[PDB]
Design a protein around this ligand. Sequence first.
Ligand SMILES: N[C@@H](CC(=O)O)C(=O)O
Ligand code: NA
Ligand code: NA
Ligand code: NA
Lengths: 419, 411, 411
Amino acid sequence: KNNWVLLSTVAAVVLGITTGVLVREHSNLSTLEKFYFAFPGEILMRMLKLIILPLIISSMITGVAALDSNVSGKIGLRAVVYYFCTTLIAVILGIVLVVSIKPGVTQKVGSTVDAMLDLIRNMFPENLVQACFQQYKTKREEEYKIVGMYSDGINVLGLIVFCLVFGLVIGKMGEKGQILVDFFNALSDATMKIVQIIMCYMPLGILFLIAGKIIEVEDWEIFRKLGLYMATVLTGLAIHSIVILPLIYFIVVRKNPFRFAMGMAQALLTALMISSSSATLPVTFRCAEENNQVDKRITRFVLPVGATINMDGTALYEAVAAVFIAQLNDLDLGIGQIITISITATSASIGAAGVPQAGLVTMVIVLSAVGLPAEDVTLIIAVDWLLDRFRTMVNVLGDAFGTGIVEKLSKKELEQMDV
Amino acid sequence: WVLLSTVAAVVLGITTGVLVREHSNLSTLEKFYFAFPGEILMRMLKLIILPLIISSMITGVAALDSNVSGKIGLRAVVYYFCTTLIAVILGIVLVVSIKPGVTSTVDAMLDLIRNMFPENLVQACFQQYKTKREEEYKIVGMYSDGINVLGLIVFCLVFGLVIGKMGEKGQILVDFFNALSDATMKIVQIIMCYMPLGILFLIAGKIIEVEDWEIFRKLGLYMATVLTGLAIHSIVILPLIYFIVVRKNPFRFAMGMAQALLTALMISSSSATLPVTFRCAEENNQVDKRITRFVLPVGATINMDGTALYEAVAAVFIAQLNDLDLGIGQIITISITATSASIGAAGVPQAGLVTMVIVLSAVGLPAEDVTLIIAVDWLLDRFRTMVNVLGDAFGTGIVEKLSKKELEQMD
Amino acid sequence: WVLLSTVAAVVLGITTGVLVREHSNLSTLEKFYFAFPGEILMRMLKLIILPLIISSMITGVAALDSNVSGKIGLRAVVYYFCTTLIAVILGIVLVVSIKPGVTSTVDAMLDLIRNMFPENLVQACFQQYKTKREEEYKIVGMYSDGINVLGLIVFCLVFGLVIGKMGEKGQILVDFFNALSDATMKIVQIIMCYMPLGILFLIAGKIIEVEDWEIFRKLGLYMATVLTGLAIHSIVILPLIYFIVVRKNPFRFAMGMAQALLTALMISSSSATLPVTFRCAEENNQVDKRITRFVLPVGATINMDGTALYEAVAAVFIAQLNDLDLGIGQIITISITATSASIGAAGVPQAGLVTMVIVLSAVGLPAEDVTLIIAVDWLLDRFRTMVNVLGDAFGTGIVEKLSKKELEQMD
Ligand SMILES: N[C@@H](CC(=O)O)C(=O)O
Ligand code: NA
Ligand code: NA
Ligand code: NA
């Protein structure tokens, strides 16, 4: 006998690929019948969005309160240094692969500061209850006057920053704040058993979520018309995630880096089907501490921060497609335009959310930084549901690799705390 | 005390409503300021339903995880759920067929399941997902306003189940919500001391706005729907469920309970008639003492068959008073919230009014029309407690035949 | 330190504000990016007022349920509430009559009561009910945005009272909100370390936008309104309240406290001036040691008479700077929020700026205009602490005459 959690998800990917292809050649469902056929995939999607509010709140508090305010200054330093050391490698390796292959040549016909100051406006929200379901967005309009309104979507950057300060303040209070450690440890345990309930609906949900995604109109634009551009994203997403990211693991940890990737197979195949790193963050929590046995004092801090900051897969997809958009024109892309692409794609991957189809909101940032218009993104919208699933597996993998790398880099400081 | 000061609110509220309408002339504005002390009560009730739903669901389910004594504890909880769901379904069918108060359907059933699993817990406290088929058609959601009662009931049932299985690790969460449910049950008692002042100005606001004698024929047909439902459930349904599993003449079982039904009328409390209905089951119908010491204590605060049927009837009567038909996605929302109002009020007779506000807010009905339910509630509250103790009485005979192998082994 | 580093923030914000305006030319866009580090401080302050209101109200009211020593404990709490309410009313009348900053009435009082009892606790954290008379007229509510400070103060007062009466059952709720209030009082101290960097860029954003010399004539009339209110309250009001109940020449009582008032100017802290004003009341004014050991400890964190008057004046001065008149429903919202700011700041002199943001958010005033309050706050902060210990000094003499029968019986 073996495990039924992973073997039924693979059996649902197989039974979901062969279902969403066969119902196209056999029957002809309307646009309304293609929304009720993907309805069990919608219930799984909003069952995972439901659990990330008590999961991010309770893991960020008990992840930092378990560290004695100077160990957490070095876990925090070894996390941001790792996140900058992987985004920069994924941006540079995506830059070299897109200018040596040159996919965009001779197939020509076929508010950056306001978006970066909205990261700091979202780290310190005006209300904590409003931060649980609303984000802040800034538009510039009239010699112009800045005016912002509250859009929708959970402010993950503002609940991480407040609970990081709330986690540090609680741990320095001693016995006067011990009841707040016990409250958010019993809440982080109770909202991980709920994730084990959603994990039993997950094979039934993927089987209709991936059958209702490949049920679209034309398999020709993805295959041949926009071909060899997907062969520059997916090659870089392969080499960064198979070769480069288990080489950073193998240098500092001598413990077989593909044994770690096999133990994260449920979280990798979830983001490969649901295309959202924040929604599969509960799967990444369980599949790291239970399978790979990485210490709970680090995964509660590294994994929520990395889900909204470390987005290596977006950084490579930003660096490939923005050059490819510029390659459909006849721009030179000199030595000054290349480095500013690799710089602003690092900030756009930081400012991008873990929500689905968040790759094209921050694509306007990198495109307008080189001078391209914002309405040149309409060439990419055709194939974006497939390229948004392979760059989320890599995003989850990057976060997972960090937990193992920071733990060996701080095995002494974790062993410092004793009786 | 609280019955005498509510009947006094109705009598002083009817006499005020006819000495103001007949002896003065108010505009549309002064008739709004006259019903202002009742408007404060209607939003003091909606204020408290959010910590009442959350704390009573988590504590009631986590108490049932600790009270179940194997198979005897499980058969009593299963029996309490079916009779409550049958009494609600009997109440829904009777109020839809008779219709007192009068004179797509697939997108409403999928909105039912989308609201059980909301996308956020904080938006579930004040917003509901509603969908709209439009344009060969498209589908758009809107996230309209009003508290999502189904999303909070379903989450806190799953959350309350998880803390019960955690044991020692989650004992601080059981202790937190126990003190949270005791605190908000004391705020409900504070609101029920303001309630006779609020019902007075809110009954009198209705008497000003009437011109007919037809609203009293609708209130008379509402009492004749509840009393019909309480008669079918106590003579036709609950003796039949006894006779399906126990072939032992259920009406002879009911005459043996005759001392317990009369004292459920005088005291009018299902928990305060316990020490008479303990002995009246054992001295007369020869039921085992091991089943009676469990079924009747937990049944006087869980098995609410007359309350659930009454809440189901009263909410559709308000939804027929204001001219609606509820479709089918709102009728199931009545049938879950009225069934879960057994757990959602943690064994308190105070919360009979606020659980009606939970059922009216689960659909989106105007809560200011609950005074017509309250104005005739004192007539029917005596008869609800008689059905609430009859389902407890019939439970001792049903669980005994299902657990006859458990009574030769545990001794 | 914190006084020395805010005066340095105002001087280096004025020196930056006059070397940028006079030596450059910014557009409407660059004037918004220059004041961006002060805009982050203005939303770090609004971030913390929601757990500060909730935790300090629940813990402060439940502490007062445990601190009252029968009749001596009740007379001191009652005295602290009337003088604070008189100093606010004196501050409201003085800022309305003088008006520094210049050059229906029944729907605003009923919106006051509708907002004390909101229809939902989660929407009360970010939304406020507002009504609109329209059409022989009708009345419609809208639920506009902005945090309902009155709904959170009134609920957590009722909630904090209930946990105090629960005792052992609610002891986990007292310990939860005590650790929650100790935690958010430490986050407020973190924000006050960023505050000198934030006031620098937010003062300099104001100096760029000025073209007149009229904002400083209004700031001079604002300091001459607070100092007038502190002079009327300490010479005319508080000696009169002493003379009504104690016929013992209140200026001789004040001269016996002369050593405690002068050391309240040097240290400028009301809790750190306790061991001098203990002996200076007993060695000179012959106060009982049993009354002094209660009134002065609890009065240094509750009786804030000079701060409450100052908060009332500063919020209407901002509401006259931005051209409004507040009607009367917003003036009562000042008079409740500034009075309840004694409990809503758990005895800390750091939190003087963040309680002003609570008063400005209770009405809906722009919180970014609080830098003109801060730029002259260091001049007035010395004189607020002298009045804050004078109400403590006059409190020991007033309660002893009221409780002379409780001092012949406990011995
Ligand atoms: N859902 C995607 C968004 C993107 O980066 O395109 C992610 O979390 O990685
Ligand atoms: Na990275
Ligand atoms: Na990530
Ligand atoms: Na990001």
